[model samples]
Target: GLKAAQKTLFPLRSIDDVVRLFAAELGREEPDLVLLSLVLGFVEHFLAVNRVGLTYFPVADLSIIAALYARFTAQIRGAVDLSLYPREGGVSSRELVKKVSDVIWNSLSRSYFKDRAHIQSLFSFITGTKLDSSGVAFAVVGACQALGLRDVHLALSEDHAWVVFGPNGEQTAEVTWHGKGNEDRRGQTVNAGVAERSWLYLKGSYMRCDRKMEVAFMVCAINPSIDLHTDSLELLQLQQKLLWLLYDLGHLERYPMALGNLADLEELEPTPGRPDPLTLYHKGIASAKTYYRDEHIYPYMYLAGYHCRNRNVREALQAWADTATVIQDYNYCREDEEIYKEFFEVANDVIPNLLKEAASLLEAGSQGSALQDPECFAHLLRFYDGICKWEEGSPTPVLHVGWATFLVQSLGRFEGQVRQKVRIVSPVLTFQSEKMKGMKELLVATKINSSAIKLQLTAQSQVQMK
Candidate 1:
C-alpha cells in the first residue's frame, strides 16, 4: 500500500502544490485552529512511545485507497458504510479522541522521543517498501512524525521533507519539501544560548561573596560593627575598601573599631520583599549567643546595637549563658529553656574531649613532638564527629562548613598534607546512606570547605540540622 502511494507522490519537488492541494481538500477556511488541535492531539497521542500517522482514502475509489494505506492500517471501520446504517456506526467523541490523545502523549514522550533507537524504529516503520537516501529518508520520516523535516543531517540550513515514488523499479514522482510544523532546530540554538549565558554569570569571575561573608569574616575576625555615621553610602562602601586594611592590621588585637564602620549595614531596610538586614544580623547574634560569656558578649552586643540599633538583649542573654556554662555557673542557665541547658551541658561534655584530642594531634605533628602522638589525630576526628553528633539536635547550630574550617585552622601548625588527610563526619547530606555499611565515609562526603569553622563553633557551637 505504501509502495503504490510512493509511486504516485515521489519526487515531491514542490511542497506549495501539496499544501495547496491538501488545503483545497479542507475548503479555504484556513487550517489554523483545526491543524493546531490535530497536532496537539498528535503530541498527546505520541506520548505513548509511538508516532501515529493517517492517510485519507477515497471511498469512491476502493482499489486506489486500498493500495495507498491498507498496509499501514490495522483495520478500517468504514465511515460511509456506517452512514448507510446509522445504528451500527456510533462511537462517543470523548471516548475515542480522549483515548487517542492520552495514549499518544504518554507513549511518545517517554519512549521514542527520549530514546534514539525508538525514534529510528519509528522512521523505519513509516518509510516502508524502500528507504530513501538516509538524508531524504530521515526528512520524510521526521516530517511524518511532526518533526518538521524527516532528515537527521544536523548541518542542513533549512528544513526539507521528501516523497519518493517507486514500486521496486517503477517510478512516478518525488518531492522535497520546506516550511511546515514546529521549528525543532530553533529550540536547540535557543537553549544553547541560554545555557552559555547562565554558566558565565553563575560561575565566571564576576562572582561575589555570599551574605554571610561580610559579618562572619569581619565581625568574627575583627570585632562586631562599631560606631559609624549612618547617613552615608560609605557603609558597605567602607567594607569593600577596608579588606586590605584588615589584612595589614591582622596582627592587631582590635577589630571592633573597623566593624563599627559597617554599622549602617546592619539594620538595612528590606529590598524586593526580602527580610530586613537587622533580622539577619539578629540571626547571627543568635548564633553567637552560645559561645561568648558576658565579657565576650559585650563586643557582639555593641556591634548588634550599631546595626540593629540596640536589640542585643537576646544576644546578651545567650552570650551570658554560654560563658557561664563554660565556668560551670548554673545561674545563667537556671531558668532558661531546660532543653537548651541540657544541650549546652551535653556539648560541654563532648567538645572539650574533642578539643583535647585536636590539641594532641597538633602537638604530635609539631617539629619535635615527644609527649603528643600522631595517632591522636584520628581520636581528635572521632571526638569531633561525636560532639558534632551530640550537638546535632541542639538549639544553636554550626554548619559542617564551619566545623571543617575550625578543625583545619586549629591544625594550621601541622603540615598541609597531614591536615588534608584529616576528616570530620557531619550529619548533613546523609540519611538512607547512613546504614548498611560505610556510614562514616558517607558522612565524610558531605563535608564542605569552610574557613570559619573554629569561630563558628567557638561562637555558635550547635548543630540544628542532622
Candidate 2:
C-alpha cells in the first residue's frame, strides 16, 4: 500500500493515499525519510501555486521523487564515503554531518528572499535550486538520513535550527544561517550563542528532536495559506490528517508549537471527535512550561489571540500579559528578529483592539467594568512593562514613540482611579534604563501622571499574575 501510494501520487487518492503512506512511512523501524520528507505535501502545495512545469497533469510522476532522491543521495555519496555511516564515534559523526550540511549549503542559490514562501520544501530545494533559512537547515538533517547517518538529528530553537550528532547525541553544529549575515558560519559549534541569553536561543530549552519529532517539525513547516485571503484546502486537509495521525501516535506531546499549529487549524474548522480548540491551546502552553522551560511565547499568543478573536477582551489581555510573563527574564537582541515582530503586533494591533473592544463592551457610564477592573488595567500595564523588562539588558531599543503612543492610549483608556489601585509600589514606574526613562517622559508628556499609572513588575512576585 505504501509503495503504491507514491507511485501514483496526486489524484483524490493521491491525497488520501498519501495519508496512509505518511502513516506507513511514520510506522517503520527504518523508513524512507528522504523520498517522503515533503514529497507528497510539497507536490500538492506546488501544484496549486501555478509555478511549476507540470500543472495540467494531476498525477505527478514518482520518477521525480526517484530522480530527486538519487541527486540527494549522489551528493552525499560523492562528497563522502557513504557506506561507513551511522557512526557512533563523535568525531566521525560530526564529520559526516558537516559533509551533508556542506552539500546542502553549497547547493543553495546565490541570493533569494529569506522570507519567500513556496521555497521551503525539498521539492523547492531540488527543483528550483533554493530554500529558506529553515528549509536549508532541515535539508542537512534530511540529507543525513538519506546517507544512512542515523545518529545525527535536527536541533531546534523557536527561531533557528541546527544538527546534533554524537555518541550520546551531545555534539551540535550550525548547519544553517541565522539572522542577517554570518558568512561561513555553516559548520560552527552551537554552544557559542547560549551565553548571551537572547530569546532566540531559549536559554536551556533548545529542543533536541528524535526522528519522529523531526517529522512533527516538517509538518509544522507545511504552509497551506497561499495568501492571507485564501488557503489550499487540499494541502490543508493533508496537513491536518497527518497531524492527527501523529497526535494519536503520541508524537506531539513534547512538541508545543506543533500543538499550537494544530490548535490554529482546529480553531478554524474543528474536527469531530478531536474537538475543542481551547484545550489544544492550553495543552500547547502546558507543553511549553513542561518541556521548553516556558521560554516560548508563541503558544500563549495562540491562546490569547483566540480569546481576542472571540472578543473576550479581558481573557485575551491576561493571556497577553501571561505571554509577557513568559518572557519576563529573557533579553532581546539582533538575532531576535522574529520575536520582535510577535510583540510588535501584540502591542500595536491585538492589544489596542482589545482596548477598543473592552471600552465598547462597557455602557456609557458603567463603573468597575473592563476599563475599571483592577486586573484588566493591571494586565495592560503588566503587558507593557514586561516588554520593557525584556529590553532591560538588550543592546537594541525595544520601545519607541510608536510603542509609547499605544501605552498612552491604553493608560488613558483606564481611569486614573483604576490605574492608582495597582502598584509598582516603587516611588515611580522606574524600569531602570534609558529607554524606560525615555518612555516615561513620553507617557508623562501625554498628560498622564507617572505615580498614578502604576506597573507592578518584579520576578514572579507580582500581586495580579495570579
- Measured by lDDT, the strongest candidate is 2
lDDT of 2 at 329: 82
Model 2 steric clash pairs: none
Cα lDDT tens digits for candidate 1, 252-335: 122232233333343442235433444433443443343222212223433434422342322322333333222221212111
The residue ranges of model 1 lying beyond 4 angstroms of the native Cα positions read: 1-11, 26-68, 73-466
RMSD after CA superposition, every candidate: 28.1, 6.2
List, residue by residue over 261-310, the lDDT tens digit for candidate 2.
89889887778999578899999889898888888878889888888888
Q: How do the predictions measure up, each by TM-score?
A: 0.16, 0.85
Q: Model 1 reaches what TM-score against the true structure?
A: 0.16
Q: Which ten residues in a row have the lowest lDDT in candidate 2?
A: 452-461
User: Which candidate comes out best when scored by TM-score?
Assistant: 2
Model 2: how far is 86 from its true place, Å?
Answer: 10
